[PDB]
Design a protein around this ligand. Structure first.
Ligand SMILES: Nc1nc2c(ncn2[C@@H]2O[C@H](COP(=O)(O)OP(=O)(O)O)[C@@H](O)[C@H]2O)c(=O)[nH]1
Ligand SMILES: [Mg+2]
Length: 201
């Protein structure tokens, strides 16, 4: 099978568990591995070139108590580092998560996601999101509770791993129905503001 270990990391409380859980089959088929303090969710996605399975590793909360063991990171073939757009500290801690990860796994494709963009009161705006630039990471705004941009990180990663820049998803996996509305106007403003921030580089 055409699988990839994906490591999902970032501060406690940023929405990691909530985000992996959108993918309903992935949630139903998860596998808990107590030796490592993890739930591995098999998130299958279907591309114009067939299926790709991301085995997403979700913590059991130990990130609140400290850093993650070598256990968690080894063999990762990709990753998502998450922060909370309503907390500057969580963004401020991004560099530390990236450093812990690349320590074990040097040349991985990584996406950075700013979560909870459904919240009107946004603290970490596009202009302040610079970490990913010099590190060659993709960035996406995300709202786990509304599925907003759910696919984006996975689609960019599938492209890097398969080596097809044109890959697309032919159908979406069944997702948990949006629990909160993502205001369409905020989405439009934010996507552009990222594009405006990128041209100051
Ligand atoms: N509105 C909103 N709240 C969110 C979102 N993602 C997470 N939260 C809230 O953030 C808290 C932490 O979420 P959790 O998924 O357990 O995160 P984790 O500790 O990083 O794995 C809970 O109150 C979530 O419901 C999001 O997309 N929108
Ligand atoms: Mg969690």
């Amino acid at each position: 099978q055409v699988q990839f270990k994906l490591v999902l990391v970032g501060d406690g409380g940023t929405g990691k568990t909530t985000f992996v859980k959108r993918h309903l089959t992935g949630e139903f088929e998860k596998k808990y591995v107590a030796t490592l303090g993890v739930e591995v969710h098999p998130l299958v996605f279907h591309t114009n070139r067939g299926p790709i399975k991301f085995n997403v590793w979700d913590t059991a909360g130990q990130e609140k108590f400290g850093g993650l063991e070598d256990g968690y990171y080894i063999q990762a073939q990709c990753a998502i580092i998450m922060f909370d757009v309503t907390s500057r500290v969580t963004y401020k801690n991004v560099p530390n998560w990236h450093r812990d990860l690349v320590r074990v796994c040097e040349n991985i494709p990584i996406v950075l996601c700013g979560n909870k963009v459904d919240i009107k009161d946004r603290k970490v705006k596009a202009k302040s999101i610079v970490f990913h630039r010099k590190k060659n990471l993709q960035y996406y705004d995300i709202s786990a509770k509304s599925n907003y941009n759910f696919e984006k990180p996975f689609l960019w990663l599938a492209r890097k791993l398969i080596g097809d820049p044109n890959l697309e998803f032919v159908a979406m996996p069944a997702l948990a129905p949006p629990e909160v509305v993502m205001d369409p106007a905020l989405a439009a403003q934010y996507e552009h503001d990222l594009e405006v921030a990128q041209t100051t580089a």
